[PDB]
């Protein structure tokens, strides 16, 4: 037969704003600005997951980590 990791079998992806804070709930056009904002809440890693609730220094660290958590936009009738 046939097989192999494929995933990404989604039709519509609706992920939160590209640059938005979870602490307060604000959004920004630039990531650089948002990064400086999060500070007003805490001065730690510029990245932090929500599902698990962990902080990361590098980007890739989170980019790949996200995997652990299912990624699929919400569907509706
Ligand atoms: Zn905030
Ligand atoms: Zn996580």
Is residue 50 within 8 A of residue 65, CB to CB? The reply is no
Q: Residue 40 has which token pair?
A: 């007003």
Q: Measured in angstroms, how far is the CA atom of residue 73 from the centroid of ligand 2? A: 17
Q: Residue 29 has which token pair?
A: 């056009």
What experiment produced this structure? NMR
Q: Residue 41 has which token pair?
A: 């809440």
The domains of the chain are located at 1-77
4: left (phi over 0), alpha (psi -120 to 50) or beta: left
What are the residues whose beta carbons fall under 8 Å from the beta carbon of 62, sequence distance 6 or more? 47, 49, 56
Which residues make beta-bridge pairs with 20? 27
Where do runs of H (alpha helix) occur along 13-72? 31-38, 59-65
Is residue 22 within 8 A of residue 50, CB to CB? The reply is yes
Cβ density class 26-64: b for 16+ within 10 Å, e for less: eebeeeeebeebbeeeeeeebbbeeeeeeebeeeeebee
Query: Smallest Cα–Cα separation from 23: which of 10, 3, 37?
Result: 37
Q: Residue 4 has which token pair?
A: 């192999």
Q: Measured in angstroms, how far is the CA atom of residue 54 from the centroid of ligand 1? A: 17
């Amino acid at each position: 037969g046939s097989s192999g990791s494929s995933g990404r079998s989604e039709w519509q992806q609706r992920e939160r704003r590209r640059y938005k804070c979870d602490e307060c709930g604000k959004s920004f056009s630039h990531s650089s600005d948002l990064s400086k904002h999060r500070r007003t809440h805490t001065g730690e890693k510029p990245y932090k997951c929500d599902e698990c609730g962990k902080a990361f220094i590098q980007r890739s660290h989170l980019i790949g980590h996200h995997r652990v958590h299912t990624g699929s936009g919400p569907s509706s009738g």
